[PDB]
Amino acid sequence: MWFEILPGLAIMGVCLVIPGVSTAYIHKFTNGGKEKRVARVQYQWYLMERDRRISGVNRYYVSKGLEN
Amino acid sequence: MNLYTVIFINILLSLTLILVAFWLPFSMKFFLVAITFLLFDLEIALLLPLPWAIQTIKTSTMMIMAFILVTILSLGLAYEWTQKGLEWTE
Amino acid sequence: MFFINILTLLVPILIAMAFLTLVERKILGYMQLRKGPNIVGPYGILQPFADAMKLFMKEPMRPLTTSMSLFIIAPTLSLTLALSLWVPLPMPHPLINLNLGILFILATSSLSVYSILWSGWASNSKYSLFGALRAVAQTISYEVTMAIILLSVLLMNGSYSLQTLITTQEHMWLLLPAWPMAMMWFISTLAETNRAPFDLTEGEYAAGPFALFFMAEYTNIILMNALTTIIFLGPLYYINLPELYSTNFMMEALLLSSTFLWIRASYPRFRYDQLMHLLWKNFLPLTLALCMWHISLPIFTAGVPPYM
Amino acid sequence: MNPITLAIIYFTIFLGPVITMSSTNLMLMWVGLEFSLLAIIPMLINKKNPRSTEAATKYFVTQATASMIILLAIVLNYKQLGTWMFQQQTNGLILNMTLMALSMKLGLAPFHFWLPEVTQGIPLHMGLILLTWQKIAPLSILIQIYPLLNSTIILMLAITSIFMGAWGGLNQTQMRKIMAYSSIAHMGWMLAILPYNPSLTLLNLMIYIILTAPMFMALMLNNSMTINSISLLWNKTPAMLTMISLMLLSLGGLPPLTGFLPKWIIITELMKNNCLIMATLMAMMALLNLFFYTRLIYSTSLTMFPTNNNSKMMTHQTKTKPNLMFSTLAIMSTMTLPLAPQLI
Amino acid sequence: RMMRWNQERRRLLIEDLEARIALMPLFQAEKDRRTLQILRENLEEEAIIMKDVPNWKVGESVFHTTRWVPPLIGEMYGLRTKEEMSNANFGFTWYT
Amino acid sequence: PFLDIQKKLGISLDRHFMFLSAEQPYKNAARCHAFEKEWIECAHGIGGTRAKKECKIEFDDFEECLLRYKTMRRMHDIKKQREKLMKEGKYTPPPHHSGREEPR
Amino acid sequence: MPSTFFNLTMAFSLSLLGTLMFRSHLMSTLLCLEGMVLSLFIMTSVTSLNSNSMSSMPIPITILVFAACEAAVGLALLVKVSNTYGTDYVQNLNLLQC
Amino acid sequence: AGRISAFLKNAWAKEPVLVVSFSVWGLAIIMPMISPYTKYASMINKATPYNYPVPVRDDGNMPDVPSHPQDPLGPSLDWLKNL
Amino acid sequence: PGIVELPTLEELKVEEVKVSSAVLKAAAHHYGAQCDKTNKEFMLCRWEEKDPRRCLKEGKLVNGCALNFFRQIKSHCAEPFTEYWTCLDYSNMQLFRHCRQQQAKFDQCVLDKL
Amino acid sequence: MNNYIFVLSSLFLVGCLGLALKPSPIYGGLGLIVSGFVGCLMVLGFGGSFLGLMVFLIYLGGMLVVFGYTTAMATEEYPETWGSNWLILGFLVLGVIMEVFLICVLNYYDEVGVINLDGLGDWLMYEVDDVGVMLEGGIGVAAMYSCATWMMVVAGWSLFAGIFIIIEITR
Ligand SMILES: CCCCCCCCCCCCCCCCCC(=O)OC[C@H](COP(=O)(O)OCCN)OC(=O)CCCCCCCCCCCCCCCCC
Numbered sequence A: 001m002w003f004e005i006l007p008g009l010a011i012m013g014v015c016l017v018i019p020g021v022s023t024a025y026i027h028k029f030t031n032g033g034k035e036k037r038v039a040r041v042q043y044q045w046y047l048m049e050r051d052r053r054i055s056g057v058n059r060y061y062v063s064k065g066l067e068n
Numbered sequence B: 001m002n003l004y005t006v007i008f009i010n011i012l013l014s015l016t017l018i019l020v021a022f023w024l025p026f027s028m029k030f031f032l033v034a035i036t037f038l039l040f041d042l043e044i045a046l047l048l049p050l051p052w053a054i055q056t057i058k059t060s061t062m063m064i065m066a067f068i069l070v071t072i073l074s075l076g077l078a079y080e081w082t083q084k085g086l087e088w089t090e
Numbered sequence C: 001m002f003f004i005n006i007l008t009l010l011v012p013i014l015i016a017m018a019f020l021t022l023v024e025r026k027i028l029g030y031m032q033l034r035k036g037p038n039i040v041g042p043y044g045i046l047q048p049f050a051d052a053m054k055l056f057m058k059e060p061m062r063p064l065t066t067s068m069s070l071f072i073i074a075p076t077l078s079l080t081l082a083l084s085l086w087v088p089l090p091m092p093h094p095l096i097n098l099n100l101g102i103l104f105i106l107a108t109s110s111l112s113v114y115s116i117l118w119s120g121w122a123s124n125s126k127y128s129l130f131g132a133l134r135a136v137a138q139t140i141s142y143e144v145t146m147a148i149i150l151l152s153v154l155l156m157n158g159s160y161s162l163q164t165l166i167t168t169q170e171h172m173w174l175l176l177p178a179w180p181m182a183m184m185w186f187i188s189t190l191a192e193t194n195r196a197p198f199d200l201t202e203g204e205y206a207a208g209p210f211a212l213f214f215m216a217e218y219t220n221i222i223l224m225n226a227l228t229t230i231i232f233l234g235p236l237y238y239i240n241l242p243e244l245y246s247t248n249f250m251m252e253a254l255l256l257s258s259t260f261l262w263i264r265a266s267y268p269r270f271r272y273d274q275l276m277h278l279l280w281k282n283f284l285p286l287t288l289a290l291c292m293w294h295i296s297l298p299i300f301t302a303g304v305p306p307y308m
Numbered sequence D: 001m002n003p004i005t006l007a008i009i010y011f012t013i014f015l016g017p018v019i020t021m022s023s024t025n026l027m028l029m030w031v032g033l034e035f036s037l038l039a040i041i042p043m044l045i046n047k048k049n050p051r052s053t054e055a056a057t058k059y060f061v062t063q064a065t066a067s068m069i070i071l072l073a074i075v076l077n078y079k080q081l082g083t084w085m086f087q088q089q090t091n092g093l094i095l096n097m098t099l100m101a102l103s104m105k106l107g108l109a110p111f112h113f114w115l116p117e118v119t120q121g122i123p124l125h126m127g128l129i130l131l132t133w134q135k136i137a138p139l140s141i142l143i144q145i146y147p148l149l150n151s152t153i154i155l156m157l158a159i160t161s162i163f164m165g166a167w168g169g170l171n172q173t174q175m176r177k178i179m180a181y182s183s184i185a186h187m188g189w190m191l192a193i194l195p196y197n198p199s200l201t202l203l204n205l206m207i208y209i210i211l212t213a214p215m216f217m218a219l220m221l222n223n224s225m226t227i228n229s230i231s232l233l234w235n236k237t238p239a240m241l242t243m244i245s246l247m248l249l250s251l252g253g254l255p256p257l258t259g260f261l262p263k264w265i266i267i268t269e270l271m272k273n274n275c276l277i278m279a280t281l282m283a284m285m286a287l288l289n290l291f292f293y294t295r296l297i298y299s300t301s302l303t304m305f306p307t308n309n310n311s312k313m314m315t316h317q318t319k320t321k322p323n324l325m326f327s328t329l330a331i332m333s334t335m336t337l338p339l340a341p342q343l344i
Numbered sequence E: 001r002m003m004r005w006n007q008e009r010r011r012l013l014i015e016d017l018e019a020r021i022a023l024m025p026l027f028q029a030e031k032d033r034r035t036l037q038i039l040r041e042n043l044e045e046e047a048i049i050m051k052d053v054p055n056w057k058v059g060e061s062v063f064h065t066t067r068w069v070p071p072l073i074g075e076m077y078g079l080r081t082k083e084e085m086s087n088a089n090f091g092f093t094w095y096t
Numbered sequence F: 001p002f003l004d005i006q007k008k009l010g011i012s013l014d015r016h017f018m019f020l021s022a023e024q025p026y027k028n029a030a031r032c033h034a035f036e037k038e039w040i041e042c043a044h045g046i047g048g049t050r051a052k053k054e055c056k057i058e059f060d061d062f063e064e065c066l067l068r069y070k071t072m073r074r075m076h077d078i079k080k081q082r083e084k085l086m087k088e089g090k091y092t093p094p095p096h097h098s099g100r101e102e103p104r
Numbered sequence G: 001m002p003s004t005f006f007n008l009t010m011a012f013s014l015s016l017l018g019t020l021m022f023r024s025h026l027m028s029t030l031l032c033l034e035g036m037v038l039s040l041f042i043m044t045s046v047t048s049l050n051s052n053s054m055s056s057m058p059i060p061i062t063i064l065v066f067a068a069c070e071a072a073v074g075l076a077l078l079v080k081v082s083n084t085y086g087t088d089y090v091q092n093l094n095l096l097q098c
Numbered sequence H: 001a002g003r004i005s006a007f008l009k010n011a012w013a014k015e016p017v018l019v020v021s022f023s024v025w026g027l028a029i030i031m032p033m034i035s036p037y038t039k040y041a042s043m044i045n046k047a048t049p050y051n052y053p054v055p056v057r058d059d060g061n062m063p064d065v066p067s068h069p070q071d072p073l074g075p076s077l078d079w080l081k082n083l
Numbered sequence I: 001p002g003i004v005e006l007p008t009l010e011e012l013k014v015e016e017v018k019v020s021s022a023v024l025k026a027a028a029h030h031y032g033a034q035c036d037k038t039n040k041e042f043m044l045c046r047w048e049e050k051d052p053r054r055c056l057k058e059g060k061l062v063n064g065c066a067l068n069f070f071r072q073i074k075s076h077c078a079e080p081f082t083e084y085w086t087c088l089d090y091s092n093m094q095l096f097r098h099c100r101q102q103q104a105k106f107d108q109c110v111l112d113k114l
Numbered sequence J: 001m002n003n004y005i006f007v008l009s010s011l012f013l014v015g016c017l018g019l020a021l022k023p024s025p026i027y028g029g030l031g032l033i034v035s036g037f038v039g040c041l042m043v044l045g046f047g048g049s050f051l052g053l054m055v056f057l058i059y060l061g062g063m064l065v066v067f068g069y070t071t072a073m074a075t076e077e078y079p080e081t082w083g084s085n086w087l088i089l090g091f092l093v094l095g096v097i098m099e100v101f102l103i104c105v106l107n108y109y110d111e112v113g114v115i116n117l118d119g120l121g122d123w124l125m126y127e128v129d130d131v132g133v134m135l136e137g138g139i140g141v142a143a144m145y146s147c148a149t150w151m152m153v154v155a156g157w158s159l160f161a162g163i164f165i166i167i168e169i170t171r
């Protein structure tokens, strides 16, 4: 009956869900538990390069804070 | 570098599939259509920068010019219509 | 990590196409009062692999009067575009975060005419060239509205980026407004993908090329429905729940891709002349009118959006 | 062709040169040229015959290549100076490429081979425009940059144009090719005097226009596109000879007639500038234009050729063609030497 | 609803740009000091790199203006690493 | 131009975005704004023959700031001498040029 | 910049060479014309982006529009030539020599 | 009135699409003059600070310009909030 | 012709902030009111006198009066600020729309202790 | 990656050379498509996002498309063209090598002049606002609607009148 197309619908649904959460997790992993910073203009790129330069390990996502 | 990688990967995959495939074993109407499509695609080119034009101060001017564009495009369409350019009855 | 992300993006969409074939067959069967595939595997989940093996194991009878170059680079191009379209899609975070992403979609979609035309010019005949010219004209014509609809709907979010529509629909879908623009967008996706009732090009290739064309077709189907979901049916985005966004996006895209097949089983075909009259006399007037309406709306309303 | 189409095409034909002359931006000048081309082609091809199609194709290709070269010149100047206008600092090669392109747009030699073919394949009211109204924008672009041009190549082009125009008109038996070569010659005179005084280029331009328009109208009176067809004018319409002869002599440049003054004053300026050898060559080779204009004055007004019979019924019929502009322009072009100090 | 939402979006954009405003001075001073130090390093190197050449004034401007002329990124990262040059040119156009 | 109907009617269709020193949309400065401004302001009122000779220092400055041939040549001479010295073993690059330093 | 501009100018020159040298077709000349158009578009956009002169970006757009119109009328003329003779050849336009 | 209204009903029956297109055209060209919320668009797009507000010298005679962001002598767009 | 003039390395040497973008952004709206005068003076020098080499005496004061701000912040009311900018740095556009209540915490804390 | 834009410009050169040499109206279309792809790539390298994507979506998707369309419907491939195609492919090879020698001689004759091979990776970007928003290319191409409305009316009129012109030419 109509409930025999689900074995395929759910397969396709899982295959369509994988990309999103995979990309999100990989971003959080490669960028220090934070989102991947976007750069639509030069100001954000400048902020990013500046964070990278002050890190001391050449990585924009190593936030330093007040301690330094 | 990332876009390059992705497109290269896709091309490689396509060529690999199509290799495995082998290794396992006159009417003027269409021309007029193309021309109309040109004259509308160039209008798209002139129309695309509206998301940046509507951020300006001269709103009374952008309103005007966009209306001019759309109106005269519609008029050209109507004329191509009246003159039996959208018929296909040879 | 990036190559791993690319794999995670590519493999599942191909699996999803291969199983969308089966879903189509089963749905059409149950709408025709029959089952569809049941045997090869439990409920048929092996039939697509069986068909792939069969095709790729056949023997290619390459037309003798032809050109190998245009014979090989047409399906290569089709699949390359059908895969590179899925790249910028925010689901919710994109593999490649582009500005002007919808423009990249427009262009990489409009680039398929070249293959759908080179195949015909390669096949040395006149009937195939007739069919190719007609299909090219159809696709071309509907690209116009496919572009203007977005040109008018991207003024509720002042940017050509796909990662802005999430916050644009953070409170309400872009369907309630522009439901007349969707109804015209939902259809140009059929005619663009030569999908019934706009299949006047498949209603002349070896196993492998036919398979690549099939893959491209169904991939483009899923992607067009995904664009519909992202634009006119903005799903939920709680900053901490990309899982939620992806679940909802999947659900809506499956709804839409099943609607396509609903339609294929429900309606007859069109006649090329009437198909072109449809656009050039019903969709283009309304499209231009609503374009002017949506250029004026953000003005006589103070709701003109930002440029971030 | 319906009124709306006519209006749009002719408004474009009119707007092209107007933008060219009223714009400071070379891009807008180029725009005007493109308008002119786009809106001229359909009128050429109206009849839809092989000859008209071929003429249209030749015109399109030539003018499009020329426009591309002009736009290259503009882009190079833009990369060189940041401005969209030629100054006193542009690499002379840019300006010489521009001059080659403008010369091919006009029809100067050795960039002239297309003009007679096109004019022949084209009807009369279209040759009129092509040879009078389509010389004003490309000449304006030059008038705007006359201080920074190359007299050497300008004079070579002008003298080549004089020579080839004479040696073409000597042979052609077709009204339209004769007019084409006359245009070539007068445009050569213009270019010659340009870098020293452009007011005289404009003088000769208006003189040549006043002299050409009424001639094409005379022809269109009977659609006499040939010598043996215009010879019957003594039986068809003999009240036009007294003026065809005078206008042809003026074109030739005979002293007592308007058409003289251009050559005379241009030679004067060239003498003030010590271009006497070139002025002499040109003045001696204009006599061939005068020759093959006298050969037509003969067959038209000083001797009667064998006529035909149905010309009797042509006499029976009346006519209302030659509007007032014919007489006005012919008089202004034949009897206006006493007013030369004002036209100068 | 779209009007009432995009107006709040405008207010938020103004807030972000105001933060940018408040920050800019710090950034401009830091950038000036950075580029000045870059040019000073390049000069202090050129001094000895080009000592034995004939008729070479060390620090010779190509202008007769006497005023400040912002340097080119080529001038700055010309003696530095090619990866630095590539980050300067194809660094923002290459998706973060 | 050839027919100053624009200046007659006191309007501007094409004569406000000709050169670099003109008005840009969001006040964004162009590269050679000051050099071109100076050249124009100094050549205003003496047009042509004079400005080609007694307004030439400023045109040279504009040409250099726009085309940069002299700067290119300078940097190239420096790099050539440096390559020769490194090849022959009479000079070594410093750390910040080699690729390592303490940044700001 | 210098190198890419030199190569762009060489390409324009090559396409003009192709135009001035026919090879029995006419499409192969219209395509050279469009190559010229493309080279000029690219050079103009590149100079605009190099100088940061955002008051000159409409120029590529305009020239693209007008090149499109020129190409359209050229294609129409070619279509008529084919409709009449049977080929987009150039030896068939031997008329007007009399 | 009668003849033209019958024409409009004939249209409304035959080609509703053309009617809707033309009516949307008219609405677009007309409503921006009726609406009161129009001016606010230019007001906002002016109020957006994409650039640095370069200050000026306190040369004495300038009482209607503040010396600190938090003074009421300058403009204040509370109307945006109230919007 | 003309020997360019530059400043030495001993100078243009100052205690930088070494603080990150999210932090500067969480502290901007207060750093725009406090420490405004010595910022406007510098952004007037740098625009009147087009040379940066003529505003180092002002850029150093900028850095100093910014360190004093970030030192007041540490002395009093460090934890709300820490959590606020930690929540900010999570996003990509570093948006103020998600961290609205931690911002109220920072604001109340600073308004009470300062 | 210093050689990036140089490689792109060289590919554009080779495409325009394969145009100059005239294989056929279809392989010429393919050459045009390649050259346009490369032109967009180099425009993006120079920062022209909008310009390059517009090239993509209009020049290729709109112009070369109708070029190939009109070609197929109004052109016939004759058998002779194949031997001559191979001949002009060899011609193309020879031209490539001649261009290489040309570039070598020009580098030998002008170090910092025609092409600064030493400074290849340099002299691509001269200046840029680092802390600046609102400096993309759309901000300029959208000037048309506020300043330079003259260009917009010009272009719209060209397109408008093209309709009448083409209907009258084809008819
Ligand atoms: C034999 C079979 C042949 C079939 C081949 C078919 C291949 C076609 C594949 C589809 C074509 C895709 C077109 C790619 C255009 C990229 C447009 C784009 O948006 O990239 C711009 C990118 C980001 O810039 P932006 O978004 O403006 O802002 C970023 C600031 N954060 O900034 C950048 O510029 C990124 C660098 C550009 C990368 C583009 C590379 C595209 C893929 C290259 C394909 C090469 C194929 C082989 C050669 C083709 C023929 C010569």
Ligand SMILES: CCCCCCCCCCCCCCCCCC(=O)OC[C@H](COP(=O)(O)OCCN)OC(=O)CCCCCCCCCCCCCCCCC
Pocket (backbone or CB within 6 Å): D234, D238, D239, D240, D241, D242, D243, D245, D246, D256, D301
């Ligand atoms: C003062 C200072 C001097 C300055 C230098 C002066 C330059 C020289 C002046 C040259 C003026 C004439 C030159 C052109 C000669 C024209 C030849 C001509 O018209 O005669 C031929 C023709 C004969 O026609 P046919 O068929 O033989 O029989 C008569 C029927 N009309 O004749 C015709 O058919 C004519 C048309 C008939 C119209 C009816 C008759 C009305 C009169 C028309 C002729 C007017 C001529 C005016 C002469 C004034 C001379 C100054």
